[PDB]
């Protein structure tokens, strides 16, 4: 991690439950943490506890970010759907979720959402918009990398 977009992605919370019993909690009541207790963990922490354990410590239940509501709302209209309201980050997280789960049915949905928002950051980069409010924070980098390249070509062609 030297990139600041990579560090901030780990701080999100995931509703994951336990399997064993631990006599200590750095977080408070009742230092023996009973099993079948559900907590929300940061993704820097619940990413190495899902492997090291044959039974690992953490069950890693699926969130609402990839529930059937969101997976149905992005097959209807990928353009006018909010992505700044879910949390804030989508593409830096849904790559991390695929590697720890190896699901071949999510990678055929994000690869179609990404094409449909790609075709409308090339239209609006031709020099009065609401598309500064409903973009993903991974797309606001390439929007400021594209709109400041068309501007420096249209500047040069006319004096």
């Amino acid at each position: 991690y030297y990139d600041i977009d990579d560090v901030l992605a780990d701080g999100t919370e995931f509703p994951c439950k336990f399997q064993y019993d631990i006599p200590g909690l750095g977080y408070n009541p009742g230092r023996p943490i009973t099993k079948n207790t559900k907590l929300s963990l940061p993704l820097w922490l619940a990413r190495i506890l899902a492997i090291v354990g044959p039974v690992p410590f953490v069950e890693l239940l699926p969130p609402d970010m990839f529930s059937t509501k969101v997976m149905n709302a992005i097959k209807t209209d990928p353009v006018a759907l909010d992505l700044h309201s879910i949390n804030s980050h989508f593409f830096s997280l849904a790559i991390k979720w695929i590697m720890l789960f190896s699901e071949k049915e999510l990678a055929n949905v994000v690869s179609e959402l990404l094409l449909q928002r790609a075709q409308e950051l090339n239209h609006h980069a031709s020099s009065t918009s609401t598309f500064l409010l409903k973009l993903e924070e991974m797309e606001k980098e390439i929007y400021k990398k594209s709109h400041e390249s068309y501007k420096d070509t249209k500047r040069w062609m006319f004096k």
Binding site: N72, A73, K75, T76, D77, V79, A80, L81
Partner: protein, 270 residues
């Protein structure tokens, strides 16, 4: 009718097996209409269809409904009733749709309307504001002559029909068949439905800076009468029809009132 209806009804016969759970619930309506007759000698005919298998059967029919619904709902209307006869043959009546919806990009609040959202499936929300009264309405009239035997018939539909428009019949009183007869209007055997117009405006919390609220008025028919109290937070789904003449018929400023022909009026609590 054409083949435009012809292939269109047939493709809605492939919607009975992929999601055959809808074909289960038609029998459950036919269950309560038998067991109520077993105690005497309640349920409507409205089927909640999720707008979720239509992405997984035909994308050229799912996007067909949300663009021009006056050409795909009345085909899917008559396709449902013939399946609502062939499975249930023991007893001797619209069978309307619902569209649960999985709400599309037409999720517009009633401040942003009327421009290009005519003839679509909007999903409007807000706070109900008038709550008018209920009156019946004629649809079918069966006449009867007792000098020559047989019954008769007369269809009669207004401009606020199911979805389309046809030649308007100002049928005041159908009488006087091609004989010497004084025909009789059989009440009881005729059909009557209920009619109720309510007006809904936008929510004051999601309002812009200080202005007047802009309301829109929605017609409910055949099932949703006395569903919501005034002053409730209501989500509604319908078709943004626009009827009336804009002063071009009276040979002489404003014109073309708009309405919504609602289906699902669905109370929310948030």
């Amino acid at each position: 009718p054409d083949a435009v209806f012809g292939d269109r009804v047939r493709r809605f016969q492939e919607f009975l097996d992929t999601f055959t759970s809808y074909r289960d619930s038609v029998r459950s309506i036919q269950v309560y209409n038998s067991n109520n007759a077993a105690n005497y000698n309640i349920l409507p005919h409205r089927i909640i269809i999720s707008l979720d298998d239509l992405r997984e059967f035909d994308r050229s029919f799912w996007s067909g409904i949300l663009v021009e619904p006056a050409y795909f709902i009345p085909p899917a209307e008559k396709a449902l009733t013939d399946l609502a006869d062939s499975m249930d043959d023991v007893p001797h009546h619209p069978w309307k749709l619902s569209f649960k919806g999985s709400f599309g990009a037409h999720a517009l609040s009633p401040r942003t309307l009327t421009a290009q959202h005519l003839n679509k499936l909007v999903s409007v929300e807000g706070i109900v504001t008038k709550t008018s009264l209920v009156r019946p309405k004629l649809i079918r009239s069966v006449h009867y002559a007792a000098k020559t035997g047989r019954f008769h018939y007369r269809d009669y539909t207004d401009a606020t029909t199911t979805l389309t428009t046809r030649i308007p019949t100002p049928a005041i009183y159908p009488t006087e068949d091609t004989e010497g007869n004084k025909l009789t209007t059989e009440y009881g055997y005729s059909t009557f439905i209920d009619h109720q117009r309510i007006t809904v405006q936008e929510m004051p919390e999601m309002a812009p800076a200080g202005q007047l609220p802009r309301s829109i008025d929605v017609i409910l028919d055949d099932d949703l009468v006395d569903k919501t109290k005034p002053g409730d937070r209501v989500n509604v789904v319908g078709v943004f029809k626009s009827l009336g003449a804009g002063g071009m018929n009276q040979s002489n400023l404003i014109g073309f009132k708009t309405l919504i022909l609602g289906n699902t009026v669905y109370p929310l609590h948030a």
